[PDB]
């Protein structure tokens, strides 16, 4: 009769095998399934982003990115509203884990992470992204450039660019003039001669390289 709203609670419930689990970010009325990485760096990771097959297209609309889309098994996106509910009621830490086509792994951690924190309405505030202190892993620091930016899609242009950077990048992200990280770009599978439109982490493999796997993890403070 007691509900786990995040996946660090599931660690406290007594479950440590990484897999699909039900958490109640809204309330006990309706759950939403997610995949949790209980193995990496002590575990307790809630995953709001997974990509590896390239099958699911992430060039979706503002509504699909608000409500969430995909399968908790494979590639998916948890949904901006859900993300806002978690970060609203608890303080969270970010880790992103990346992999290229050369059997190399990398990552980057951010101490604080929140979507539109202390915003009375996420819509009005555009679901701004905030990230603070950055601890270096394999990859560099791309997200600090994005902090303070509303989430943008080809439906809703919030970026600071005259053009629609979400449209030019074939993805969705908290864009500024334009991204240093486009983890929702098109899965071009390796190197590409086009500019900054694939799943790109600028500081690790530049703008002309599309990763193979991608997932963004979240844990309690």
């Amino acid at each position, epitope marked *: 009769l007691q509900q786990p709203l995040d996946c660090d609670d599931i660690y406290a419930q007594g479950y*440590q095998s990484d897999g699909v689990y039900l958490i109640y970010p809204s309330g006990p009325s309706v759950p939403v399934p997610v995949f949790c990485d209980m193995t990496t760096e002590g575990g307790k990771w809630t995953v709001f982003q997974k990509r590896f097959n390239g099958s699911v297209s992430f060039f979706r609309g503002w509504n699909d990115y608000k409500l969430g889309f995909g399968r908790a098994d494979g590639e998916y996106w948890l949904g901006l509203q859900n993300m806002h509910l978690l970060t609203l009621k608890q303080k969270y830490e970010l880790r992103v884990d990346l992999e290229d086509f050369e059997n190399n792994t990398a990552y980057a951690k951010y101490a604080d992470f929140s979507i539109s924190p202390n915003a009375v309405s996420a819509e009005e505030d555009g679901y701004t992204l905030f990230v603070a202190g950055f601890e270096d892993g394999g990859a560099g620091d791309s997200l600090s450039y994005h902090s303070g930016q509303k989430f943008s899609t080809f439906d809703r242009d919030q970026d600071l660019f005259v053009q629609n950077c979400a449209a030019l990048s074939s993805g969705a992200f908290w864009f500024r003039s334009c991204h240093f990280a486009n983890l929702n770009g098109f899965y071009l599978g390796g190197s590409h001669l086009s500019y900054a439109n694939g799943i790109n982490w600028a500081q690790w493999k530049g703008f002309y390289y599309s990763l193979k796997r991608t997932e963004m993890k979240i844990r309690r403070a």
Partner: antibody
Amino acid sequence: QMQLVQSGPEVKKPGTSVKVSCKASGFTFTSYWMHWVRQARGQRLEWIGVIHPNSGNTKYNEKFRSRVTMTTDTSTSTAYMELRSLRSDDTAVYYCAREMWNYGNSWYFDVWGQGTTVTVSS
Amino acid sequence: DIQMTQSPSSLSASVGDRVTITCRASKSISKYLAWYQQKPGKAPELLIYSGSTLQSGIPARFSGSGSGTEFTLTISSLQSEDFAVYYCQQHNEYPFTFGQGTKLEIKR
């Protein structure tokens, strides 16, 4: 106060089984993970495995699988560890320890029992 | 898998001195390490965790540093209570290894 009360010492012959109990008081037993560690005298400590009382899920050390099995009695707030087939080198002090939670890696033991010296010899 | 080797095997120092103990890792272990203090015939007590963070109630003179393969435990000024055996734990991966143990004794 938060205390873990282990069983008294036992002397066993080779090949037999020993069952060590560890009772919890001062904290809700179902909330925290429980670890089992042995300290051979003047030697490096060895982590046996882990068990959570609420779920009963277990994760053992690779070399001790098939030999050790962990159970918990929720009503009595007791944690059990049992090594099935004993071996002369297993003579050591066996501790039960609680993993604190701490918004991250955790997996470090903040409260310990007080030792169950187990002697195996013919 | 992920052996832990402590150094020095035995160390002798007097009260008030600055003392340093080192734990070495066979493989890259990341930020995460913890130290313990075991008195004779007692259960170990946890001092430092995740490499550099100390437990509540532990004196301020205890401090830890290091990352990757090398780690260090240092005490600003010893006290009579500080003399014991110190152990280093693996902490990062789930095989879970421990350190060889370091004797800290008084020098006369």
